[PDB]
Amino acid sequence: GPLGSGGQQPVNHLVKEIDMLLKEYLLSGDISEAEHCLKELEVPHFHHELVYEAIVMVLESTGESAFKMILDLLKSLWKSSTITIDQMKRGYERIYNEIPDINLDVPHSYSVLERFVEECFQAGIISKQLRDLCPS
């Protein structure tokens, strides 16, 4: 019985779906093709992570290239009945509790989150509650 790293099996396949999905979309540039991959799976209890990862993705990035991609990506998924109101709020709240160094160290991401949040406020996907939760 050689080795022995954990008594469980590799079940992190779903995690790769989003990782590859986001990257793929950022490469191609089609929201219709992206949603297609998400439609294949019916796990609404996981998609919540997609939003967060998507937001943080650009938050750390450097350019509006991904900013509009992610924002427009989640925006469509929200009105496409793919991202319930409880999902977005739950995904955004994570940002307020997942910005340890993203804000302090390397001052630039914060300026993005603000624009990303305020931008959604006008889209009609987030209520004053969430927008108010974000630091301005």
Swiss-Prot record:
Effect listed in the UniProt record for changing residue 105 to A: Strongly reduced interaction with EIF4A1
Tissue expression summary: Expressed ubiquitously. Highyly expressed in thymus and liver. Moderately expressed in brain, kidney and spleen; weakly in lung and heart. Expression is up- or down-regulated in response to apoptosis inducers. Regulated by many programmed cell death-inducing stimuli.
Top-rank taxon: Eukaryota
Intracellular or extracellular location(s): Nucleus; Cytoplasm
PTM comment text: Polyubiquitinated, leading to its proteasomal degradation. Rapidly degraded in response to mitogens. Phosphorylation of the phosphodegron promotes interaction with BTRC and proteasomal degradation.
Every MI domain range: 13-136
Disease affiliated with this protein: Decreases benign tumor development and malignant progression.
Free-text comment on this protein's domains from its UniProt entry: Binds EIF4A1 via both MI domains.
Summary of the function given for this chain in its UniProt record: Inhibits translation initiation and cap-dependent translation. May excert its function by hindering the interaction between EIF4A1 and EIF4G. Inhibits the helicase activity of EIF4A. Modulates the activation of JUN kinase. Down-regulates the expression of MAP4K1, thus inhibiting events important in driving invasion, namely, MAPK85 activation and consequent JUN-dependent transcription. May play a role in apoptosis. Tumor suppressor. Inhibits tumor promoter-induced neoplastic transformation. Binds RNA.
Membership in a protein family: Belongs to the PDCD4 family.
Name of the featured protein: Programmed cell death protein 4
Naturally occurring in which organism (per UniProt): Mus musculus
